[PDB]
């Protein structure tokens, strides 16, 4: 039995017209939620020098995506919505894990998940560079100018539990092991 997980689902199937929400029981926090996107958000990576590695997402394309993910989460919990960073778990769930070329990449999505969308015309609080690293276990890093290109087809989320958690509703990436 090996290990499989990630924050963002890449290169899979896309929703036909509107965004989808897959799960075994949506009211079960222990159960993993599956987000399916209508339009694919592009993801570009680059390793130009030692030890600079980064992952670039479009800000206007991501805020459009997230704000529209909140209008669908509203359809189950008609309340204000928060997208936030996870509090625990292994590296593959705390970072966006992927192997690009021959090098495995771990990057932080602290920038993607830290928004609050109101009940009314969905709002933020008021590009996106994801700091990335590669495992320096086996063996010494490879020089530039390596590039990665992929598509965000979905997201793997977990809703925060409790009654004590009033006000808005909070979701964090991870899961959850198996995919759709």
């Amino acid at each position, epitope marked *: 039995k090996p290990v499989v997980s990630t924050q963002l689902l890449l290169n899979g199937s896309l929703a036909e017209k509107e965004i989808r929400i897959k799960s075994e029981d949506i009211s079960d926090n222990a159960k993993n939620i599956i987000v399916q996107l209508t339009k694919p958000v592009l993801i570009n990576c680059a390793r130009p020098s030692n030890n600079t590695q980064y992952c670039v997402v479009n800000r206007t394309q991501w805020n459009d995506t997230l704000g529209q993910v909140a209008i669908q989460l509203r359809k189950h919990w008609n309340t204000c919505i928060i997208f936030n960073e996870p509090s625990g*778990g292994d590296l593959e769930i705390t970072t966006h894990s992927f192997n690009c070329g021959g090098e495995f990449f771990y990057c932080n999505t602290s920038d993607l998940f830290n928004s609050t969308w109101n009940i009314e015309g969905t709002a933020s609080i008021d590009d996106i560079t994801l700091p990335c690293r590669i495992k320096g276990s086996g063996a010494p890093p490879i020089q530039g100018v390596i590039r990665c290109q992929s598509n965000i087809t979905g997201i793997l989320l977990t809703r925060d539990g409790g009654s004590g958690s009033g006000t808005c509703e909070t979701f964090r990436p991870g899961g*959850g092991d198996m995919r759709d």
Partner: antibody
Amino acid sequence: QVQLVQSGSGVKKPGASVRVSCWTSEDIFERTELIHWVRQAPGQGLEWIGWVKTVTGAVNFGSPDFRQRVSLTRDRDLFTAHMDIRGLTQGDTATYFCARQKFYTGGQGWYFDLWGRGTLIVVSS
Amino acid sequence: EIVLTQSPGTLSLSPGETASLSCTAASYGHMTWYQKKPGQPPKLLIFATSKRASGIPDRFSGSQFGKQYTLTITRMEPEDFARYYCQQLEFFGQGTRLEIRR
């Protein structure tokens, strides 16, 4: 007489921390999806604190007040689980229980077939 | 906590008599039932509203009537005299204690 094994009861000082542990056998551990932590103060009921997944390590807490102080970890090779409580207060004087949930399908609900006999934490100065 | 209220808090019964413990959940999700004695770990009896765990006998049963989720203990035995809590997922009931009526 019998699984799963919980840490010895203790007297802790207000403001301190406590590493409450839980451990079982490989065959009992390989059949567990989650490890939940639930508490009971004397004269109060069973209250869910949080959960930890035996595979991914992922967590979930009952309130914002458990999120910043409670840390739920597990050792996949030694077949254990742990609960760290930061900023100990008299409100935290309770019997901390642990419970396992078998690999289940959504809808059925939560069902804890095995329970640790408990660990009494007394926040006393 | 709005949902998950339970009642009565105390059931005065004699052995042989039948207990009827009710849990009121503000939603249609499945109920679980635990037996709890003083200074003893909770013992799972019922899960999935109607389904009893291996090693639990025909005396204990589980049922639902909308938001009313009830546990029945027919032909009550001395050991069965304890405290009972229900959890609907992450939530637990206020509790109910079964005492010897005299």
